[PDB]
Amino acid sequence: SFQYPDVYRDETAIQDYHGHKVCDPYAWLEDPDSEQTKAFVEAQNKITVPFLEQCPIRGLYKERMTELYDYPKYSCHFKKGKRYFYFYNTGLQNQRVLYVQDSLEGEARVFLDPNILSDDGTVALRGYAFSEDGEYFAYGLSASGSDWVTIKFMKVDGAKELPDVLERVKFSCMAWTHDGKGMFYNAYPQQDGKSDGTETSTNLHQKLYYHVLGTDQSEDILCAEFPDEPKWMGGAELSDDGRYVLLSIREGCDPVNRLWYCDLQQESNGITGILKWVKLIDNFEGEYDYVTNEGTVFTFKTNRHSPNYRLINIDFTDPEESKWKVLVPEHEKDVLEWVACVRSNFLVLCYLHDVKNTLQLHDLATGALLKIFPLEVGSVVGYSGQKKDTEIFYQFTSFLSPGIIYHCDLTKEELEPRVFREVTVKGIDASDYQTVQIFYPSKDGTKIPMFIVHKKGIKLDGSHPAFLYGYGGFNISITPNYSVSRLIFVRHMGGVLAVANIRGGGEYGETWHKGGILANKQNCFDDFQCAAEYLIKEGYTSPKRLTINGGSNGGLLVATCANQRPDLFGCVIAQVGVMDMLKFHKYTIGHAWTTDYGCSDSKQHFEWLIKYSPLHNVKLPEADDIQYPSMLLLTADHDDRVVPLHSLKFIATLQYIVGRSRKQNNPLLIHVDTKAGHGAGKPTAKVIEEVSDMFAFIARCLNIDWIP
Numbered sequence: 001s002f003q004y005p006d007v008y009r010d011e012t013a014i015q016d017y018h019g020h021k022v023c024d025p026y027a028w029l030e031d032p033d034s035e036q037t038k039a040f041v042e043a044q045n046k047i048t049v050p051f052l053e054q055c056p057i058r059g060l061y062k063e064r065m066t067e068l069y070d071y072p073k074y075s076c077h078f079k080k081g082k083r084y085f086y087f088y089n090t091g092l093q094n095q096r097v098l099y100v101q102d103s104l105e106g107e108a109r110v111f112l113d114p115n116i117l118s119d120d121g122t123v124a125l126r127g128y129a130f131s132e133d134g135e136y137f138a139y140g141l142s143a144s145g146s147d148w149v150t151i152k153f154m155k156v157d158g159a160k161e162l163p164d165v166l167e168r169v170k171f172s173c174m175a176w177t178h179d180g181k182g183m184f185y186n187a188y189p190q191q192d193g194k195s196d197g198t199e200t201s202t203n204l205h206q207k208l209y210y211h212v213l214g215t216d217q218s219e220d221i222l223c224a225e226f227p228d229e230p231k232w233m234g235g236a237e238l239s240d241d242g243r244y245v246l247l248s249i250r251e252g253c254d255p256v257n258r259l260w261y262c263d264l265q266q267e268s269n270g271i272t273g274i275l276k277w278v279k280l281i282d283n284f285e286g287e288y289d290y291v292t293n294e295g296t297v298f299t300f301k302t303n304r305h306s307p308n309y310r311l312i313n314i315d316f317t318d319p320e321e322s323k324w325k326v327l328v329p330e331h332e333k334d335v336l337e338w339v340a341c342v343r344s345n346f347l348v349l350c351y352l353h354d355v356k357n358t359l360q361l362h363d364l365a366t367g368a369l370l371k372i373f374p375l376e377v378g379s380v381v382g383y384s385g386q387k388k389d390t391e392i393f394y395q396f397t398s399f400l401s402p403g404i405i406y407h408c409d410l411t412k413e414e415l416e417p418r419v420f421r422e423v424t425v426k427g428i429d430a431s432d433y434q435t436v437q438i439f440y441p442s443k444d445g446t447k448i449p450m451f452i453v454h455k456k457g458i459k460l461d462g463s464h465p466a467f468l469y470g471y472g473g474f475n476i477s478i479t480p481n482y483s484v485s486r487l488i489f490v491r492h493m494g495g496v497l498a499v500a501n502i503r504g505g506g507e508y509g510e511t512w513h514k515g516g517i518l519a520n521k522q523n524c525f526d527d528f529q530c531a532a533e534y535l536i537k538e539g540y541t542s543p544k545r546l547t548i549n550g551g552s553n554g555g556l557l558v559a560t561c562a563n564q565r566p567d568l569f570g571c572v573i574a575q576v577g578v579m580d581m582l583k584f585h586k587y588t589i590g591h592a593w594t595t596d597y598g599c600s601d602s603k604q605h606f607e608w609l610i611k612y613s614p615l616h617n618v619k620l621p622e623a624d625d626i627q628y629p630s631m632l633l634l635t636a637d638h639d640d641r642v643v644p645l646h647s648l649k650f651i652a653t654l655q656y657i658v659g660r661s662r663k664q665n666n667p668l669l670i671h672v673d674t675k676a677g678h679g680a681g682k683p684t685a686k687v688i689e690e691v692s693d694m695f696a697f698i699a700r701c702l703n704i705d706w707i708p
């Protein structure tokens with residue numbers, strides 16, 4: 001009932017990659033500003049939108065979604081100075097709001113409402129930092145979902161807006177020096193062309209500046225720069241005593257960093273230029289994440305010779321590795337997620353035990369286990385408690401639990417944590433659904449964890465629509481989260497939810513990470529393909545009714561699996577994904593992902609990439625009874641994280657190579673949203689629209705009837 005647009009093929013766009021010749025006939029789609037690209041985007045949306053709204057389930061869904069998603073969304077309370085703050089979204093607000101109250105008992109008042117900044121909610125808060133005395137506040141503002149940030153400042157008492165403004169900020173830190181004179185932050189060199197998120201220009205030479213309040217940005221002090229290394233990025237932070245400036249130098253997305261420090265008492269007259277950095281750890285062999293310090297003895301969470309991480313103390317007066325003391329040895333199985341120091345000498349260790357979180361209280365001096373905090377199965381997605389705090393707050397979330405915030409007064413003999421707040425989403429009955437965690441072997445036998453959710457009592461006859469989700473990369477762990485959107489799939493679409501913790505992530509330490517990157521990248525596609533076969537063999541679903549979803553790095557995942565095993569799925573939703581594995585390093589911050597995929601500039605890497613690159617491996621099955629799965633690619637014009645050209649070229653390729661076939665009846669579509677980016681800061685209204693599209697696609701393609 002619909003035909004695809006004619007898209008010019010530049011058959012002369014041939015490039016040589018180490019003796020190999022590859023044709024990129026839609027390379028012209030790499031210019032966001034051309035009239036041709038604009039005409040192409042407008043045309044594609046001209047066929048997608050209608051098709052999506054033509055589904056009577058789309059409105060049913062959006063309605064249901066609007067009611068179920070309408071619940072109070074709170075964040076952990078956190079104390080800065082003598083006041084308390086917490087984010088709160090009454091329900092369907094575009095962006096959450098920052099509240100402030102002088103007392104846990106006192107009345108809270110609005111502090112910062114990003115909602116009065118843009119009628120549609122596409123201006124989001126991206127990063128904030130309070131001054132040591134909690135008397136001054138700084139926050140980053142992002143428009144249309146770009147990573148680019150604008151740092152503004154506020155006076156806490158009275159919530160007065162200051163005139164200071166910092167531009168050209170991206171992937172920056174925010175560290176105030178304890179004297180309250182200024183803050184450290186990162187910026188990029190003023191470059192030609194635009195800088196609003198629609199550009200594809202590569203970000204290099206990020207520098208470290210220091211901004212003194214009450215001055216103009218032209219006056220900022222350059223405190224660190226690496227002109228010999230364009231890719232390095234140095235984030236800064238102050239130690240608990242405000243005496244040292246710790247600079248973590250990073251290159252790429254690997255769990256490793258260089259560690260230089262600066263003794264602020266050694267600076268002749270303060271911060272007037274490039275600091276007298278001491279190159280403590282001058283290499284990229286391991287990650288060193290700062291926890292706390294006592295005098296010159298610093299406590300760090302590291303992964304050095306410890307794939308599952310551990311805590312170690314370093315004395316800046318005797319730095320020799322041969323002298324580091326192990327505070328909390330590495331666990332043989334559990335991965336030490338993060339650590340916090342609270343109440344002067346308490347350590348909060350959060351572990352990942354079989355894709356589940358656990359909280360324990362340890363002693364700083366010896367590092368001995370003091371207490372375990374009971375936690376049901378799920379994850380901790382919120383926490384507050386600084387070294388100066390005498391109490392802690394943490395938020396628990398699961399597949400059927402919207403979230404419980406717990407409190408614990410650490411100044412009491414009996415450390416009994418009590419429930420501070422508990423959210424519930426009526427219209428959904430947890431008692432009706434069951435969560436189960438299984439382990440299935442992959443092509444090489446490696447047992448892989450997977451979560452499974454569905455209504456109780458379902459008969460495993462492969463007659464149920466299944467939704468399999470996954471990421472698989474960059475040391476990212478997919479733990480239990482609440483998702484109204486997905487629960488409506490189970491309840492009103494009789495579907496089965498399942499999440500595979502395939503290799504490439506960090507569910508099992510760096511070892512797990514390295515098991516799915518560079519040369520072992522194919523391991524990620526095998527693990528995920530095996531999870532689909534498992535669900536099909538065990539009776540949960542059938543290929544014709546199995547949908548797979550992934551976003552960003554996970555978009556590469558599903559896009560690649562569709563290419564390698566199209567017979568295994570009946571629907572594919574790839575969100576803002578990577579498709580051109582040959583040039584991803586050429587745009588914006590793509591050069592950073594090479595530590596996981598490699599670079600096509602190397603003849604050794606090229607060989608791995610050319611084997612799975614979604615864009616270069618589209619091919620119509622030779623088998624007559626086999627066609628490509630229905631496919632929906634979601635992208636946006638301001639995604640400066642993963643440029644849209646990846647999806648643009650990939651779709652053009654699909655419709656030409658496959659869409660043009662006679663046996664192809666399954667639609668290959670794309671939707672390019674406007675005024676939105678990679679996903680962070682996306683307004684509540686745009687997000688309701690997105691899921692309504694995704695599930696309208698499934699229901700219409702798999703022909704699923706709604707269940708009241």
Ligand SMILES: O=C([C@@H]1CCCN1C(=O)CCCN1C(=O)NC(c2ccccc2)(c2ccccc2)C1=O)N1CCCC1
Nearest residue numbers: 171233234235250252253254474552553589592593641642
């Ligand atoms: O968005 C992404 C991936 C995954 C998440 C982070 N990411 C990024 O591409 C992160 C880009 C920006 N960035 C770096 O290039 N290094 C990080 C870093 C982030 C996480 C882990 C290690 C380093 C950094 C540098 C200095 C100081 C602090 C942090 C950072 O934020 N992808 C989209 C396409 C596939 C990968």
